[PDB]
Each structure stands twice: as C-alpha cells, then as structure tokens.
From a paper:
Recently, several unexpectedly diverse compounds were reported to deplete cyclin K by linking CDK12–cyclin K to the DDB1–CUL4–RBX1 E3 ligase. Here, to investigate how chemically dissimilar small molecules trigger cyclin K degradation, we evaluated 91 candidate degraders in structural, biophysical and cellular studies and reveal all compounds acquire glue activity via simultaneous CDK12 binding and engagement of DDB1 interfacial residues, in particular Arg928. The low-affinity DDB1–CDK12 interaction primes the complex, while the ligand, through filling the kinase pocket and bridging over to DDB1, drives robust association, offering a rationale for the unusually broad chemical diversity observed.
First, we explored the CR8 SAR through the gradual simplification of its gluing moiety. While a phenyl ring on a propyl chain (DS11 (3)) supported robust complex formation (EC50 = 57 ± 3 nM), shortening the chain by two alkyl carbons yielded roscovitine, which gave much poorer recruitment (EC50 = 703 ± 144 nM).
Numbering used by the authors:
A (entry chain A): 1 to 393, 708 to 1140
B (entry chain B): 715 to 1039
C (entry chain C): 20 to 267
The structure:
C-alpha cells in the first residue's frame, strides 16, 4: 500500500457564481461569491466590499441562490453540490461569534437518470413555494418549500422535452410557472408549464410555444411590471409574453457570444449582458403606458457600455457599482458612469481581484538563486492570458505579466536567462482573405519577430475553405526575459499549426541549449491530426534560429528529454530520437500500445505514459537492446488530465472527474502477471481539475528547516486557480493522521451537514469508492482552528505506533505542534 | 493447411503489449509478421498441472470454432511457444489463442465518459448484439457472462461478443444442474440470485437489457456488492418477486430466504420515462422477472426498436477528437 | 478452416505403427484393447456415452499420426478420456482415472504408466491437443440413430428393437477404424440397415415415403449400398472373430 498527503497551497480563485441579497441581516446588502468548494460573504459599502465570513463546503457548489420565504426576516441560502448534496443555510451572529446554520439537508441523487448536457440548473419560485432542479434529461425535480421538509424530500415530474437548454420561474403567474428553451430535431423552442404541488404534475402553461433562434442560450425572467421572459441568443434578443412578441437583432452582439445576465432595475427596466470578449452591454426595456393604466413593453434597445473581464457571473450592487466575477481572468469591481469618458467608455475599473485563472502549465524556477523556488504559471485565456510569478513571503506574493493571448506551455532555459512560452491568439477571416487580430498581444508586441517558412506540408492539394468572420488560432513561441518579463522574440508558427509541447534542453554531444517545440497540423475536417513537426530552435543574440525540423505523422502532444535523447509522443506512438552530429533527429525506438499518448514523464530509464482512456503505463528504455519494454500498466480505465512520478515505484495521476489516484508496481515477483499489473493503492476526490504536476517547493530553504515528516514535493495547478501539493508519508505517520481525521470528522461541524468521507470518495459517474492512501491535509490543518474543548475531545484515547515508544498517548498540545510542522511545507 | 492448429509458433507474431489480463492467462496485442494484421493473443498456461489445460479455454476453443457470426469474435488459430525438442515431458511451454484485435471495449468507452450514444447508435449496437446472441441461442449455447467488458467494438461500429470461458450447452428437454451463479452480480438475472441452477437462455437476455438501460443512462442500472442488495435494487425497479408475476418463484430455493424490504411495485416505465417509447417497451420485456415471461433474442430482434434498423448503416459511435483531448 | 478426419481403408496399411513393423492384426488388436480400456474405465466412472466415444475418437485419430511402439496405448487412452471429460462437460480428476485404470489393469499393463502414472498422462495432454489439431467438437452415430429413428412411425416394439440392436452395433464399431473411414451419419444409417436385415424388417414402410426403397437417402444423401455393406461386413467380422454373436 502507499501513503500520501495532499494540501492546498492556494485556494480556488476563479468565480463560479455570485448572487446579491439580504443574507447576513434583513438590513445589509450582501454579495455572496462562490469559488469551487468555497463561499465568500461580503457586505456592500459605498467604497467597496467589506468581508464578513468565509466557509468551505465538502462539495463543488453547483447551485447558489438566495430566497426569503414568508415568515422569515432575512434571506436564506440554497446550495446544491455537484454530487447532489442539497441544503438550506442561515447566517446567525451572536456578537463576535459568526456561524452558519444548516436548516435542511439531503442528497437528491436519483438511482436512474441521465445527466443533462447543459448541466445542473436550479431555480426558485418567486413566491418561494418550491425549488426547481433540472438534474437529468427528461425529468424535473421539485423540492417543495414547506416548513416540515427538513430533509428536502422531493418528487420528479416527467418532462416530455428531453433536451432542455435553460429554465426559469416566471413572475406574475396565477400558479408556479416555468419558462424554458428546449431543443428537438425541428430547432429550438420556448415553452411554458405550470407546476402543481397538489397534483405533482405539470398542467398546460400560460402561453403557447414559439420557435426561437437555433442558438437560444439563456432565459431571463422579467419582473412583474412587464412580466414574461427574454431569450438571449447569438444574433437576437426576443421578448415573449402570451400574445406580445418583440425581437431586436443589433449587429453588435453577433460578434461575440453572450454568456451572462443580471438585473439592474428591480422593475426589469434595465438588464446587464456580457459576452466572451469582455464587452459589457445594457439591455433596455422601453415602457409604454396605455390610458387603461396598464404598462406594456414597447421596444428593446441594446447599448454598449465598455469592457470588463471575461465574466462568468455579473451582479450589480448599488449606485454605479457592478461586481464582475471572472473564471478565465481576474474578477472586478467596475463603476458605470452616466457620462462616457473621452474614449467613449462608461466603464471605469475600481478594484482588481487576483484570479490565477486556468493554470494550463507551470514550472518552478529559482530566479534569484535563493534555494526557494518561484512558480511561474501560464494563467488565463484570451484577453486574460497572463504569466503569474508566485513566491512565498503569511501570504503569497503574486506578480502578473499581461499577455492578452492564451498561454499554453512554459519552460525555463537558464543558459538564456529567459523563458520559452507557447501561446495562441484569435484572428478572424477578414475581407483581405487573410486574418486580423481582435487586439494586439504578446506575439504581436515582441521586440523581434519571425514567421516559419517550412515547406514540409507545402505540397498541400488539400482544400480548406474560409468564410469571412470565422475564428482561427495563431500559435507562437514567445521568448521572455526572466527579470523584465518583456517579450524579446515571437515566432509565429505555420498556418493551422498548433504548438502542443515545449522543452528546453541539450541533446547528445551538442553543447548548444535548444528550445524544442512539438506541433500538430489541425484541420477542422480531421478527427485526429495526421501531420506534425518537431522543430529545434536556438535562441541566440536576441534572434531565434531554426536548427532542424522533423516531420511526424501525427500530433506531438508531449515531449521530454531522456538522457541526451528526445522522447516525444506522436498520437499512439511513443518515440525516442537521437541527436546526430549532423544536428538532425533520428528515430531510435518506438512503442505503439497506446490509444493516445497524451502525457509523458521520466525518471532514470523509466517512462510514465498517460493515455486518454487507458490510464497510465510504466515503460522502460533498455539500453543494452536499444528499445522499449512494457513494465506494467494500470488496467482500470480512467480519463487522464495529468500524471507524475513520485518515486521509482509510485505513480500519481489525475482524472477528468476531479479525482486523484496513485499506482504502484505490485512488487511481487511470483508471476509475470503480478509485476505487469500496476495496482491502484491511492484513491482521492480532489474536487479540482489538475492540468500540470510539477516537482518543486515554494517554501524558503535556508538549510535550517526542520526535516518534516513529509517526504517529496509535487505541486499541481488546476483550472480554478487552485494550487495544491502532494507529498509522501511513513506508514506510521499516515495511520496517526488517518486516525485523527476520523476523530476530527466526528468533532467538526460541516456546512450543509455533508459527510467528509463522502466528499472525498472517488467519484466517477459509473463507480464510487471510499478514499484510500491519502490524508486530507486541509482537514488536518483545521485542527489548529477548532476550540480548545474540541481539541482535547479529539485527542482522547489516541495512541501512536512503532515509534521510540510503541504506544504513546497524545495530548492537545502534542498534536498542535505536529500540525504546525505540517503547515510549514507550504 | 490452415486447419492444423497448435503447431505454428508464436514467433510469427510481433508482440505489441498487454491489452488485458484474462482469467486463465494474460492477453497481449500483436501484429502478424507475414500479413500485418493485428491480432490479440490469449495466453494459455498448462504448466500449473493442477488439472492440465484450462476447461475455460477448452470451452472457448470448442464453441468459437463452431460459431460463425459477424457479431461473434473469430478465433483465427492456436500457436505455441518454441517447444522443447523431442522432450514433451520437460516441455512446459504455453499455448496462445489468436483472435481478431478489437479497437475498444465497451466498459472502457463508458468509463471514460467520452463516448456519447445517440438512439440510432444504440439501435445499431443492440441489433448486432441480439443478432449474435440469437445465433448462439439458436445453436443452443449459453454465454453465461454478459458484461460491458466482454462487449468489444471496432471504431467502424461493429460489435462482437467475446469471453466464452463460462459458456455451456443448454438442453430444453433435459434439465441438468449447472454452476449456481455465472453472470457478474451487476448484470445477474434474478433467477440466479435465487439459485435456479437450471437456468434458461433468458439469463443472457436480462444482462443485455441491463446494458440497454446502461447505454441510455451512461451508468450501470443495478450495481451492488451483495446478492441481496442487488435483489432489492432490481426489486425496486422491476418489482418485488411475487407469485402473481412469477408463478414458480416459490420453487426457487432462496425465495423465502432472500426477501426485499417491501413488495415493491414495478416502476420501470416511470424511472426510464426519458427513454424513447420504442426502446422502453424493449426494456420492460428484457427486464422481466419471470424467465418464462421474459422476451427471447429473436423477439428482441423482431422489434419496432430494432426490426427496421438496417445493418448497412452501422452508425459509428462518437469519436474523441483533438479538441476533446 | 477445418481438418479432414477420414481416411481410406487402403491408407491404414501406412500408419506409423504399421511402418515400424507392427502387423495389421496387432494394430487392430491394440486398437480394440485401447478403445475397450477407455470404454471400461469411463463406464466404471459413470461417464456419459458421448464422453466415452469422444475419448475413443481422439484415441483412434491419435494413432494415425503416431506409433503404438512409442506411445503406450493405455496411457494414451487414459489421457484421451481425461480430455474427453473436459470437452463433453463430464469432467473427472486425473487421479481418479488412474485409480480406475489401476483397478482394471494387471501389473504388467499398468507398467506403461511408469513410476508416476498421473504425470505420464498429464504430460501427454500437450501432444494429444496438437495431434487432434485442437478440433475438439465431435459428433457420434448415437445422435443420428435417434434423430432418424424419431422419424420412423409404426410398431413401437419393432422400432425399439431396431434401435437397441443398432445402438449395440454403434458401441461395437468404436473398437474399429470405421470412426476413421465414415462420417457418423453414415454409421448411424449402416447400423439401422444392419439391424433391419437381421430382424427382417423393411424400414422403407416406417418412413414418410413408404415407397422409397432407399430409406437411407431421406436421411443421408449420396450413400451407395456399397458403403453400407462394407460397414456391415466390418461390424459382423468382430462378432465372427470373437466368440460373441449378433445380439438379436
Ligand atoms: C477489455 C476486456 C476484454 C475481455 O475479453 N479484453 C479484450 N479487449 C479487447 N479490446 C481492446 C482493448 C485493449 C486494451 C484495453 C482494453 C481493450 C480485445 N480485442 C480483442 N480481444 C480478444 C482477446 C478477444 C480483446 N479482449
């Protein structure tokens, strides 16, 4: 068996949802921001936000909504986790003591159901009579909000429309009414139903179905003065309410897909819209009052306000202040002005909240020679693309390098006092027949620049037609100085050439240090790329010179230096190349038992190969023979997102289901079968998506640092900006820490009353397993924050094993010292 | 000639790697040196000398040389390790069963969650599987181990049935005792939970229906670790075993012993309301508690859901692209 | 695809056993003894008639590729029966076959099994499988005797007498090389033909074509009487050579 420890170095920073209400007091205006597994509660002031409370939940927050049922003084909070844990929460404050009350809770998972394409949707009735959940295709789940439903018991209503895009509860209806957009073979439609808690079924809805735009994406529930709903698409915005129908199709919105909506005026006069290019719009409802006294909707208007970060959630707060919650870039507070500035913008940024964005790749480098190590991360996407340099100093110091294009891979080349970074920028087919970039970015603002002239694929004769307005990716290698972080050089790759892998190394007997890039030729028609280039570049005297190129019959997804040789993965094949005295690559040996060789890692003459669905494989290079041998494979099928080698026997992997596992050589030489079987000995539900595993530590090493119980150091970056650390433990230390977790879980109160053991259980949709071989360090590190009575309660009857003293009782002060040493690893 | 098996050497194959570990030996992917065709070679070791050649392999050799069907895997030949010269007693070399290589296994495709099955894909899948099962059932052979891992698929959309290590002949006229529990618990029919021991070909139908539901939910329908817990899960959806729905349930040894918590009513149509009507009817018939009332393979093939499916269009399943990477 | 398991009578002059100097009579005696050993061992173990026959067919086929002087018959017979049990799903443990073989064989005979009987048998399994070319499925005259008899309608007792007599002839033909000369379907007809002659029954009448004098043709196409007589001649020879007489 294997024993490991996992802790969070940086909490998730990307904003996954945000809502406003009166949650902490019936008087205060609250902003609740949701990061993965984390809830932040703020109070809105005239200058900005005042933080009041933050809690973690043992689950990914999927639904977050504030409602106030009749009889309550203040808003209650509904949260549903991605594993279908539901709960209703209340804020309670007693002077200086702030705690979160779990008013109702339960798990709403169905034994049989198909998870929907557009994900979990949760909505609440305007009269707070019920919570609507769309969890499975063809089913609508209703949790009625009666006082007695403390377990959140619920029933399903059969739904004829299997493929639902979005749903909202409407305002101004005689009964609880849902309005939704759905897709069937005939296009997209908008339809209504009434929900009857008495009959536990749908009844005919208030207004008839209407055929809507093919890419109708979002449903906006308009308030009582107007009633009805607004449907947001790619080209048009329509208003529907019985007989009334309006449609505005302003050309400006066609340019970028609109992704988020919020209400500015409680009456529904003004709504805010945002799109993936960061543009922020105001949607205006132009009223017309008849002599009857009735208020109708006259027209819709769309007005461009300015630019914000690419935003997952928008919430207007008060006055001219809007909170911009961003998942791909830094989140923001911006002020909307009535008068435009001299550039034509009504939006002026107030504060910037750091978001490590998606961490696509990262490396640890000791820039200042300090024995510490700093983390340079490829963070963000598109306009929010950034390099983030992170050092420890008690908070983490983060520097941001704006790139305004997507960073893909990073590698450090010390000989050149610089970094190599792969990046891609979006251009659009313009009227010239070529393409034009939406905004200048790192690859265009390089001091010196170069464009590849390779004729390897020039024979073409394969037609790829271009329509004006279509997007294309343009990939570059950026040379970036390690002190100024100024773009020194940018090499634009070939048309339709994607840069997938990057290494900096010496090869063979060649004293020169090269940047080597593995590419793929990507055409929309190809399911799998069938062409590729391995390019060798030397950065010298401010100019990058192509030393050699190797044509391959696929995509070079991953490359890694292997004892003076170049190990590259081309589609199914894993290949080892030798660097000749003629400065050309030569195939040496190949391994082909892979569906898709996405990830590669080396230790000695051993290679760890990561497959899309074939989990992980342990290869070995056999020098006596000049070829590869398969040592052992993990037969259990898992989808891989990143792998890493912990030691000569243990191997770490990350699943696309937000799970971590550790495989080991079965170390029993009895039969050939046992050795060739990698046994999974660690299972852990991380809750984050791991892209990059990287050996290194951010902690300052003065050489005086006490040798911690933990041995080894693997950092990892995730999509939500979370940075974590994996390390190994001795059998004794693990058993001690594991026994303590079980003790801590009985003592510590979970928000939503979510069992910790469930949260960390390995979870694929098809299989669920209890965690094994992993210590939730974040649970262990919470021992220091529980009150003294609880600390002593935890240590009762706690014994140590196999130490200086075989059995040794623990006191609350002994464990406080142990955990405090464990907090020093990050 | 092509028919003189057991003599050709495994030298004739370049071994690529280990695809999976079989129960009686490990299975390796290989390329034929002469033709280039990819084949999967199953390792048969008699060195154990406990009972000599595995009967599980003997069943696969006996049955698969008899069964010819597009939806049934073809054993191409049997080859051997370099045998010891003129000393058979010293020789402990192993034999290999050559099979056509298949690109993917169903269990792997579902587990990655990358594959997406449309109704038409499922139709093409189910039609092939049932056509293979009907061929086998018509030849009076029972598979006895229908699992997602044993369903093999080529990217073309061709489906083939695989492990026959537990297959045995069924005699309708003569009921004879068999192995009490054959199919994996997740796909085991209620009769085997209750220990009929004289099971009918309907055991395979139950499993295939479990697969039908699995293709729609992307999640196994009934997954448990204990035989009673599975009976409860089956009972919740298909209804509790009771004399009205299963007149002969009282004769099954474990009817009184193994009981569900309640006498649950059948809810299959409700819980699978999202499944298309043509298919839902197929499921209700395949997942019928009473083996005598459970539909046959031919009946599943003569189906509104499957009868009008044309095998010319095999509907290739959704392939993960570079973008999916 | 599939191997040819049938030879011409003339070819039996050139079995390995013949060419190593064994005379025709001795190989015939060796075959009867080996077949009867397989039959007797498995009958003592309670084995189905198909299992006994399958072992005997393996045995006969084996000595078309090997010599009796290099492979002891009783070891081979025991190995065949052992494998036959696994093929026909009537399995037996090798130790139990040895136990029974020891009970029925004298001391000289059991000397073939050598110092370790189980090992000599289990080791032979490799050769047997390679020799029979892994063509394990075998059909036997029994099933055809019944498939064909079921289509006869008439005096219940006259037909049952025909079947049992023919069934006896099937059991006796297992001691001969007929299993190597003619498909089982032909054997089943031949024994019906023989029993019909001996009981003075005219099977044509019991068939759905009472006027089709050649009743064998509605069961087995393309069989001349020449063949059915050759088979009958070979079966009755065993009775004339031995003290035993036709069952009647
Ligand atoms: C994956 C389990 C499956 C069970 O028979 N094994 C398997 N799986 C096969 N599929 C390919 C595969 C490769 C690697 C992992 C999983 C599946 C396959 N192809 C041909 N064969 C022969 C032995 C019948 C195959 N056998």
């Amino acid at each position: 068996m294997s024993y490991n420890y996992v802790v969070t170095a940086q909490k998730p920073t990307a904003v996954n949802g945000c809502v406003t209400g009166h949650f902490t007091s019936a008087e205060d205006l609250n902003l609740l921001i949701a990061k993965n597994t984390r809830l932040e509660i703020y109070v809105v002031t005239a200058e900005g936000l005042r933080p009041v409370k933050e809690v973690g939940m043992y689950g990914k927050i999927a639904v977050m909504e504030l409602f106030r049922p009749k009889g309550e003084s203040k808003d209650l909070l509904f949260i549903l986790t991605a594993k279908y844990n539901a709960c209703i929460l209340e804020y309670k404050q007693s002077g200086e003591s702030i705690d979160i009350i779990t008013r109702a809770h339960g798990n709403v998972q169905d034994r049989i159901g198909r998870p929907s394409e557009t994900g979990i949707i949760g909505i609440i009735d305007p009269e707070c009579r019920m919570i609507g959940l769309r969890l499975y295709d063809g089913l609508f789940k209703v949790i009625p909000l009666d006082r007695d439903n403390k377990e959140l018991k619920a029933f399903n209503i059969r739904l004829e429309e299997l493929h639902v895009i979005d749903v909202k509860f409407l305002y101004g209806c005689q009964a609880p009414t849902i309005c939704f957009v759905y897709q069937d073979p005939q296009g997209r439609h908008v339809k209504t139903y009434e929900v009857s808690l008495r009959e536990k079924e749908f009844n005919k809805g208030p207004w008839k179905q209407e055929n809507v735009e093919a890419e109708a994406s979002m449903v906006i529930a308009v308030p009582e003065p107007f009633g009805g709903a607004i449907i947001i698409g790619q080209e048009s915005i329509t208003y529907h309410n019985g007989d009334k129908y309006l449609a505005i199709a302003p050309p400006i919105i066609k340019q970028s897909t609109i992704v988020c909506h919020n209400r500015v005026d409680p009456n529904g006069s003004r709504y805010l819209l945002g799109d993936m290019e960061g543009r922020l719009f105001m949607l205006l409802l132009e009223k017309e009052e008849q002599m009857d006294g009735t208020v109708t909707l006259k027209d819709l208007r769309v007005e461009l306000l300015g630019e914000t970060s690419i935003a997952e959630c928008l919430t207007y707060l008060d006055n001219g202040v809007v909170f911009v919650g961003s998942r791909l870039g830094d989140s923001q507070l911006v002020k909307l002005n009535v008068d435009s500035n001299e550039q034509g913008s009504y939006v002026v940024a107030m504060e910037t909240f750091t978001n490590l964005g998606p961490i696509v790749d990262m490396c640890v480098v000791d820039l200042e020679r300090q024995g510490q190590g700093q983390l340079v991360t490829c963070s963000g996407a598109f306009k929010e693309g950034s390099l983030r340099i992170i050092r420890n100093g008690q908070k983490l110091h983060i520097r941001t390098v704006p790139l305004y294009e997507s960073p893909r891979k990073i590698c450090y080349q010390e000989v050149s006092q610089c970094f190599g970074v792969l990046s891609s920028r979006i251009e659009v087919q313009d009227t010239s027949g070529g393409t034009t970039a939406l905004r200048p970015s790192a690859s265009t603002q390089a001091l010196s620049s170069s464009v590849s002239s390779s004729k390897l694929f020039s024979s073409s004769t394969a037609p790829h037609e271009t329509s004006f307005g279509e997007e294309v990716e343009v990939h570059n290698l950026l040379i970036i100085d390690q002190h100024t972080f100024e773009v020194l050089h940018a090499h634009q790759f070939l048309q339709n050439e994607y840069a997938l892998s990057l290494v900096s190394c010496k090869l063979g007997k060649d004293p020169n240090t090269y940047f080597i890039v593995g590419t793929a030729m990507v055409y929309p028609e190809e399911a799998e790329p069938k062409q590729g280039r391995i390019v060798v570049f030397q950065y010298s005297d401010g100019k990058l010179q192509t030393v050699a190129e190797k044509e391959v019959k696929g995509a070079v997804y991953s490359m890694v230096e292997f004892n003076g040789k170049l190990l590259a993965s081309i589609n199914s094949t894993v290949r080892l190349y030798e660097w000749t005295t003629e400065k050309e690559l030569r195939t040496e040996c190949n391994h082909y038992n892979n569906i898709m060789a996405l990830y590669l890692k080396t230790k000695g003459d051993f290679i760890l190969v990561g497959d899309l669905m074939r989990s992980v494989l342990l290869l070995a290079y056999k020098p006596m023979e000049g070829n590869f041998e398969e040592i052992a494979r993990d037969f259990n099928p898992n989808w891989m997102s990143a792998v890493e080698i912990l030691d000569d026997d243990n191997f770490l992997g990350a699943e696309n289901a937000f799970n971590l596992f550790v495989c080991q050589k079965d170390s029993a030489a009895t039969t050939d079968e046992e050795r060739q079987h990698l046994q999974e000995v660690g299972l852990f539900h991380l809750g984050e998506f791991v892209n990059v595993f990287c050996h290194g530590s951010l902690v300052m090493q003065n050489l005086g640092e006490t040798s911690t119980p933990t041995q080894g150091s693997v950092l990892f970056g995730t999509v939500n900006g979370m940075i974590g650390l994996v390390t190994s433990l001795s059998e004794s230390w693990y058993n001690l820490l594991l026994d303590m977790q079980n003790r801590l879980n009985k003592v510590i109160k979970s928000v939503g009353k979510i069992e910790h053991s469930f949260w960390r259980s390995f979870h694929t949709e098809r299989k669920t397993e209890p965690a094994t071989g992993f210590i939730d360090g974040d649970l262990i590190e919470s021992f220091l924050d529980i009150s003294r009575p609880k600390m002593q309660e935890v240590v009762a009857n706690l014994q140590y094993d196999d130490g200086s003293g075989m059995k040794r009782e623990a006191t609350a002060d002994d464990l406080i010292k142990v955990v405090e040493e464990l907090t020093r690893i990050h | 000639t092509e028919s003189d098996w057991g003599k050709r050497c495994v030298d004739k194959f370049d071994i690529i790697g280990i695809i999976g570990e079989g129960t009686y030996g490990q299975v390796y992917k290989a390329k034929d040196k002469d033709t280039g065709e990819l084949v999967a070679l199953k390792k048969v070791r008699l060195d154990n000398e406990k009972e000599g050649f595995p009967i599980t392999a003997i069943r696969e050799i006996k049955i698969l040389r008899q069964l010819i069907h597009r939806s049934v895997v073809n054993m191409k030949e049997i080859v051997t390790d370099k045998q010891d010269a003129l000393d058979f007693k010293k020789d402990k070399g192993a034999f290999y069963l050559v099979f056509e290589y298949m690109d993917h296994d169903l269990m792997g495709l579902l587990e990655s969650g990358l594959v997406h099955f449309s109704e038409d894909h499922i139709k093409s899948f189910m039609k092939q599987l049932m056509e293979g099962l009907e061929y086998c059932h018509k030849k009076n052979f029972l598979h006895r181990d229908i699992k997602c891992s044993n369903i093999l698929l080529n990217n073309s959309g061709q489906i083939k049935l695989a492990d026959f290590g537990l297959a045995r002949l069924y005699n309708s006229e003569e009921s004879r005792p068999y192995t009490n529990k054959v199919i994996t618990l997740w796909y085991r029919p209620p009769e085997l939970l209750l220990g009929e021991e004289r099971y009918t070909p309907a055991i395979d139908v139950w499993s295939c229906g479990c697969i039908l539901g699995e293709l729609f939910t992307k999640k196994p329908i009934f997954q448990a670790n204990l035989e009673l817990a599975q009976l409860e899960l089956i009972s919740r959806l298909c209804g509790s075993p009771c004399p009205a729905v299963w007149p002969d349930v009282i004769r099954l040894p474990y009817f009184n012993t193994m009981k569900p918590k309640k006498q649950y009513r059948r809810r299959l149509r409700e819980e699978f309301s999202f499944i298309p009507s043509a298919a839902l009817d197929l499921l209700d018939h395949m997942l019928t508690l009473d083996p005598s009332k459970r539909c046959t393979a031919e009946q599943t093939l003569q189906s509104d859901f499957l009868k009008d499916v044309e095998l010319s269009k095999m509907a290739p399943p959704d392939l993960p692209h570079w973008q999916d990477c | 695809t599939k191997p040819c398991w049938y030879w011409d009578k003339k070819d039996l002059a050139h079995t390995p056993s013949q060419l190593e100097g064994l005379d025709p009579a001795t190989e015939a005696r060796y075959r009867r003894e080996g077949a009867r050993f397989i039959f007797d061992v498995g009958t003592r173990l309670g084995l189905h008639y198909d299992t006994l026959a399958t072992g005997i067919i393996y045995f006969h086929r084996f000595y078309m590729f090997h010599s009796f002087k290099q492979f002891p018959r009783y070891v081979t017979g025991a190995c065949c029966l052992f494998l036959a049990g696994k093929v026909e799903e009537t399995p037996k443990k090798c130790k139990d076959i040895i136990k029974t073989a020891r009970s029925l064989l004298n001391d000289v005979q059991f000397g073939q099994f050598g110092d370790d009987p189980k090992e000599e048998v289990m080791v032979l399994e490799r050769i047997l499988l390679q020799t029979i070319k892994f063509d394990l499925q075998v059909e036997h005259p029994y099933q055809f005797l019944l498939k064909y008899a079921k289509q006869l309608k008439g005096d219940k007792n006259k037909i049952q007498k025909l079947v049992q007599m023919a069934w006896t002839f099937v059991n006796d033909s297992l001691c001969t090389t007929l299993s190597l000369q003619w498909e089982p379907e032909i054997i089943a007809v031949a024994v019906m033909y023989l029993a019909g002659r001996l009981c003075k029954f005219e099977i044509q009448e019991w068939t759905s074509k009472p006027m089709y004098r050649r009743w064998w043709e509605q069961f087995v196409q393309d069989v001349p009487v020449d063949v059915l007589e050759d088979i009958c001649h070979q079966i009755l020879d065993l009775y004339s050579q031995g003290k035993q007489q036709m069952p009647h």
